[PDB]
Amino acid sequence: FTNVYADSFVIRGDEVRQIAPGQTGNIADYNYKLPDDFTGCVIAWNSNKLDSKVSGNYNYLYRLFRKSNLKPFERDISTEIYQAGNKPCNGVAGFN
Amino acid sequence: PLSETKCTLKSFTVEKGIYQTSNFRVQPTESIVRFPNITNLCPFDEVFNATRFASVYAWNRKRISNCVADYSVLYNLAPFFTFKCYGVSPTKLNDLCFTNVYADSFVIRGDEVRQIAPGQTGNIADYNYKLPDDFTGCVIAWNSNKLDSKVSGNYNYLYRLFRKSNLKPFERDISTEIYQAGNKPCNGVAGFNCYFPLRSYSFRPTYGVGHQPYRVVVLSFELLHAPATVCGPKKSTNLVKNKCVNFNFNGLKGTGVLTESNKKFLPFQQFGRDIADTTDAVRDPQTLEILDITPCSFGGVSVITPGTNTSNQVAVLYQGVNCTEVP
Amino acid sequence: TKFKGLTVLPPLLTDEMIAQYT
Amino acid sequence: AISSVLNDIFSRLDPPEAEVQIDRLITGRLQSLQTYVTQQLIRAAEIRA
Amino acid sequence: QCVNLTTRTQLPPAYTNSFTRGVYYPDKVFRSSVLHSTQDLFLPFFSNVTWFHVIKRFDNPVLPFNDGVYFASIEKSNIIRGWIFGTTLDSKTQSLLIVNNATNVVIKVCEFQFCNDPFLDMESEFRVYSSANNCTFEYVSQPFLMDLEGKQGNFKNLREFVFKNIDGYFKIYSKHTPIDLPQGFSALEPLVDLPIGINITRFQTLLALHRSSSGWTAGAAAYYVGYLQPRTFLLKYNENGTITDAVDCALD
Numbered sequence: 001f002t003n004v005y006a007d008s009f010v011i012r013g014d015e016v017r018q019i020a021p022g023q024t025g026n027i028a029d030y031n032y033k034l035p036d037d038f039t040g041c042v043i044a045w046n047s048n049k050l051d052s053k054v055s056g057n058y059n060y061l062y063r064l065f066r067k068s069n070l071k072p073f074e075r076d077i078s079t080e081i082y083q084a085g086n087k088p089c090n091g092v093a094g095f096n
Numbered sequence: 097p098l099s100e101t102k103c104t105l106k107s108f109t110v111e112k113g114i115y116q117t118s119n120f121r122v123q124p125t126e127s128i129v130r131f132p133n134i135t136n137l138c139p140f141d142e143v144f145n146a147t148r149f150a151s152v153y154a155w156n157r158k159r160i161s162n163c164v165a166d167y168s169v170l171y172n173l174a175p176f177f178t179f180k181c182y183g184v185s186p187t188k189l190n191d192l193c194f195t196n197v198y199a200d201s202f203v204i205r206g207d208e209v210r211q212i213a214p215g216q217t218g219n220i221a222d223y224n225y226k227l228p229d230d231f232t233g234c235v236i237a238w239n240s241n242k243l244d245s246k247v248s249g250n251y252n253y254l255y256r257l258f259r260k261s262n263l264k265p266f267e268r269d270i271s272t273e274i275y276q277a278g279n280k281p282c283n284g285v286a287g288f289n290c291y292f293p294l295r296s297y298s299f300r301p302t303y304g305v306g307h308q309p310y311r312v313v314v315l316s317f318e319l320l321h322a323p324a325t326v327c328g329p330k331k332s333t334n335l336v337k338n339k340c341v342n343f344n345f346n347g348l349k350g351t352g353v354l355t356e357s358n359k360k361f362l363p364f365q366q367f368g369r370d371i372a373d374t375t376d377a378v379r380d381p382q383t384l385e386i387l388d389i390t391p392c393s394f395g396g397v398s399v400i401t402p403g404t405n406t407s408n409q410v411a412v413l414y415q416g417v418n419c420t421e422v423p
Numbered sequence: 424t425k426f427k428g429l430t431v432l433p434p435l436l437t438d439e440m441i442a443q444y445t
Numbered sequence: 446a447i448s449s450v451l452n453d454i455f456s457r458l459d460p461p462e463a464e465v466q467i468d469r470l471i472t473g474r475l476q477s478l479q480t481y482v483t484q485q486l487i488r489a490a491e492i493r494a
Numbered sequence: 495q496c497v498n499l500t501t502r503t504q505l506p507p508a509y510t511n512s513f514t515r516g517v518y519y520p521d522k523v524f525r526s527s528v529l530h531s532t533q534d535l536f537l538p539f540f541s542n543v544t545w546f547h548v549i550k551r552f553d554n555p556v557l558p559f560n561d562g563v564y565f566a567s568i569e570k571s572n573i574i575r576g577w578i579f580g581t582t583l584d585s586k587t588q589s590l591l592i593v594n595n596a597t598n599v600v601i602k603v604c605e606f607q608f609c610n611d612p613f614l615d616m617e618s619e620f621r622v623y624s625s626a627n628n629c630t631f632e633y634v635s636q637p638f639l640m641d642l643e644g645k646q647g648n649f650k651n652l653r654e655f656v657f658k659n660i661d662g663y664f665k666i667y668s669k670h671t672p673i674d675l676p677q678g679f680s681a682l683e684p685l686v687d688l689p690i691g692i693n694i695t696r697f698q699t700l701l702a703l704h705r706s707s708s709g710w711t712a713g714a715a716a717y718y719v720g721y722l723q724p725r726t727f728l729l730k731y732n733e734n735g736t737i738t739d740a741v742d743c744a745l746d
Binding site for chain 5: 159320321322323359360361362364365366367368369370371377
Binding site: 391394396415416 | 426
């Protein structure tokens with residue numbers, strides 16, 4: 001092959017079964033998808049003797065909500081608050 | 097259309113004659129999305145809008161079957177404290193039809209918000225009420241401080257701390273029996289190796305974060321092989337006659353035009369087909385009307401031309417279509 | 424001695440012109 | 446195929462599972478089209494003689 | 495209640511023959527002036543249906559459900575008030591009961607305690623069932639008005655019903671037309687579809703009573719109970735979409 005694009009990301013073991021083309025889930029809709037013509041492999045390793053913490057590790061983050069379904073091979077860098085209604089958020093959480 | 101002859105025959109030299117190239121088709125423009133009436137509403141006011149309540153073991157289910165429940169005005173308003181569930185989005189519940197809908201009302205402490213989860217263990221969820229692992233629904237908390245609260249506490253309803261064993265989901269235990277830790281019999285009262293599980297509510301709006309009354313409604317959703325009698329509402333569009341459009345119905349998806357049908361129909365019938373099993377007639381879901389489904393206007397295109405070394409002049413033949421129907 | 428995408432081609436020589444050959 | 450409607454395959458089944466069930470409906474209708482062109486060539490030879 | 499009357503006795507199984515009747519709409523699809531072939535559970539042409547009579551006798555044997563139910567009755571004053579649909583015929587399981595008081599037809603699946611010969615006077619439960627508990631299901635029909643009094647003249651009420659259970663679904667095919675044998679051909683129409691999802695292995699019937707234990711006097715009616723069989727019919731459709739003729743695939 002010509003080149004390869006490695007995608008490094010950390011997903012917990014309850015949600016780790018959603019990585020496959022054509023799934024439906026929290027990560028599988030609003031975060032990470034695969035196309036039907038995708039060519040490659042998925043390789044994971046158990047990090048629980050290294051990356052874990054007793055009080056919990058809040059440094060790694062994830063995003064649940066999006067207004068629509070995200071296209072694959074696209075990163076979401078947006079800090080914009082999800083707005084359900086007509087109330088402006090002004091950067092913070094609140095009504096709608 | 098002289099170049100349509102060269103693409104089909106795969107040659108740059110067109111011989112003298114008549115050659116068939118492609119077929120003319122009028123493309124559809126708009127789209128019609130239909131959904132039936134919101135009539136026969138369902139009493140969802142016995143959980144969300146209800147004044148009274150019960151305790152965490154005293155919870156009474158509300159049977160929701162064969163009715164149309166409106167959740168769509170609540171998701172666009174949302175005065176909700178915290179909603180958390182797993183795998184099923186609460187905003188996707190509005191367009192889905194669910195067979196068995198159960199709903200209850202119970203008020204929990206503010207430290208018990210994390211004690212309501214699918215697969216939750218502890219001294220709260222295991223001894224009173226917890227969510228099963230196969231539960232497909234979602235739970236919505238609501239702030240009880242403006243209605244259900246009381247000054248200095250609530251002494252009318254009490255909650256149970258302890259139980260002798262672990263309690264399954266879909267269980268209602270109203271029993272007053274005392275937890276027995278040791279071999280000493282408690283005889284209904286506290287004593288040696290006996291803990292008293294019954295505690296009064298601390299609920300007042302002027303106290304802190306760790307205890308507040310919260311109205312918690314668990315929506316139990318079950319999909320069986322029986323068809324669903326409970327559906328949520330969906331916004332629809334208007335009806336366009338005598339124009340080429342796409343069809344989006346409840347049980348039908350197609351492309352065609354809508355004309356007036358003179359055929360008689362059955363009152364229990366949505367759609368009906370012909371010899372090719374293609375739907376030529378459909379009932380409107382909102383009102384009683386029959387519409388004849390006809391496909392959009394098509395025809396074959398034949399190109400009449402001389403040779404390429406003679407002339408570039410193009411004569412276009414439209415087969416089966418009259419000259420008034422060409423625009 | 425109804426259009427699903429199948430059409431009938433018309434004939435070239437009409438039946439009135441067959442009887443003028445007759 | 447399970448259903449003979451192409452709209453019922455695409456709106457329900459997965460798109461890796463849709464390409465099996467649609468291509469059975471394309472191939473089976475071309476075998477009826479291969480039957481129809483071949484029987485008209487036999488009747489063209491009988492009407493030629 | 496537990497004592498059988500004079501009308502309950504051992505009688506022979508005298509049978510009649512049906513020829514045209516027993517054809518319903520197998521689907522909801524309107525088809526006009528075309529030929530159609532389908533396979534569903536149908537009443538067979540040239541069969542033996544078992545004829546029953548009520549006048550010093552009343553006929554209610556306990557009949558198994560598993561071949562299917564074809565009901566047809568020729569009446570005046572509407573003697574048959576409903577049916578009993580169950581399995582083990584006791585309070586251990588849920589059973590279906592149809593109660594017609596000629597205002598609103600009461601359709602309930604609940605746990606009832608069945609006697610041998612249930613009676614209906616108003617209505618009387620018990621002798622139909624003494625006690626009832628443990629059911630979440632209640633269903634009502636569309637309201638109407640009928641007369642339970644006796645009429646003169648010819649036989650003006652012919653009710654032809656097909657009752658079947660396919661994969662836990664209960665359907666009622668209802669046709670009423672004016673008319674001890676029926677003649678002519680007609681097409682049945684569907685009425686009530688309830689996804690109940692219970693096992694029904696046996697069925698019984700109900701009886702209306704009039705009085706001017708043994709003091710109640712049953713009416714005069716005649717009916718028969720047919721069975722179904724997986725067979726293929728050809729249906730003749732007119733321009734209005736009704737079945738005027740039916741041809742069996744394999745008979746003759």
